[PDB]
A and B are shown apart, each in its own frame.
Chain A
């Protein structure tokens, strides 16, 4: 199985640099080109460039103005992208992708690395319980920066009736909520807990939902 494992989400000061990585497995690393692709606001895709891991040779989209530099470590099967002089316009998800033979036909993609560029400090979320057939409970995750957060319920043992709403930005902080729906015969008799992680602040909070 071809695997392309990218590094985690990054917050970058406006004007500073970021270096992101993509660890390949399941094939001969030097036999395929690696490409880097930008996706803004979860929609439009833009090619940044490619690198030949056999000879370390890169080609770049000229619209990048020489701000990107690709490298590889063949011993660890890792491709790197350093991206300099970042502005808010560079906030996006960055993908690596493999091509056959190389350069033309992209065939496998990494999971993406979210890069946020901002002058703002990291702020952990406040996590508040939402307590009021089926009962609907929830978790309010308020006033954090940057994205993302991850929310689970009962550490993954409740999954079927869960919706997590996309975050909304207001005055430079994010807020989101998550909803879970369980049998009335299940809660409050059994424990229901939301687990919220915010990578940027190294925070994880468990909040039990108790009747109010």
Chain B
């Protein structure tokens, strides 16, 4: 198989600014018929893959002229003259000169924006879950930027580390923010042996963390 190597594998772009992806093949993609079957593909979140460029530099009909493809032989480039919000997604180069068709690993393009502090919410276990004998406490850390964030759980003033599962969204296409959920799962019996439950979010937007708590006695 022909190896397709993209660089960089991640882009972080200010809207309006140019960006570029390189693609290098382990073997020339020039055919004996005189054509070079080097292609670019975009997969946006919530969408099917879509064709961007084919035959090195030909634009798909649905693609704006902000995109250009260039290159020859073993070395290829995708350029975006001015990045727009719609450009968020994963870009693949792929070749159809040799059998089998092979794809690069993908370059993930993310957008820059102004720093935003998280909106933090904490939720006790539902009555439904407690009736079943279980207890999940959930913390949302919503609509923040940049990506890096820390969540600390405290129970009755004591830092708690185990039974915590975290999940992070992909960057939002509408506002360029991130969100994260954190779920602490205890037995109902352990849950009921404590009073206060606290979620603490540490983000670059403040020296002090954002603390949300509830008390079972309240």
Contact = CB atoms under 8 A, between A and B. Distances in A.
Interface of A: 35, 43-47, 59, 61-63, 95, 97, 103-112, 126, 128-132, 134, 136, 138, 140, 142, 163-168, 170, 175-177, 179, 181, 212
Output the residue of B101, B121, B180 with the most chain A CB within 10 A. B101
B50 A104 contact: no
Interface in B112-140: 119, 121, 123-129, 132, 136, 138, 140
A108 B61 CA distance: 12
A46 B103 contact: yes
Nearest to A128: B126
A103 B179 contact: no
B100 A128 contact: no
B126 A212 contact: yes
Contact of B140 (A103, A128, A168, A179): A179
Nearest to B129: A128
Nearest to A209: B126
Interface of B: 1, 37, 39, 41, 48-51, 54-55, 60, 90, 92, 94, 96, 99-103, 105-106, 119, 121, 123-129, 132, 136, 138, 140, 142-143, 165-170, 172, 179-181, 183
B124 A212 contact: yes
A43 B90 CA distance: 8
A47 B51 contact: no
Nearest to A167: B167
Contacts of A95: 48-49
A175 B165 contact: yes
B138 A177 contact: yes
Closest CB pairs A-B (n = 10) = A47-B101, A45-B103, A130-B123, A128-B126, A136-B121, A165-B167, A61-B100, A104-B96, A165-B181, A109-B49
Contact of A43 (B54, B99, B106, B127): B106
B49 A166 contact: no
Q: Which has the most chain A C-beta neighbours within 10 Å: B51, B143, B172?
A: B51
Main secondary structure of the interface of B (DSSP, over half): strand
A208 to B, nearest CB: 11
Contacts, number: 120
A163 to B, nearest CB: 5
B92 to A, nearest CB: 6
A142 B168 CA distance: 17
A130 B138 contact: yes
A175 B185 CA distance: 11
16 contacts: A45-B106, A59-B99, A105-B54, A106-B96, A107-B60, A109-B49, A136-B119, A140-B183, A165-B167, A165-B169, A166-B168, A166-B170, A168-B166, A176-B167, A179-B142, A181-B142
A168 B166 CA distance: 8
A105 B142 contact: no
B142 A163 contact: yes
Contacts of B103: 44-47
B35 to A, nearest CB: 8
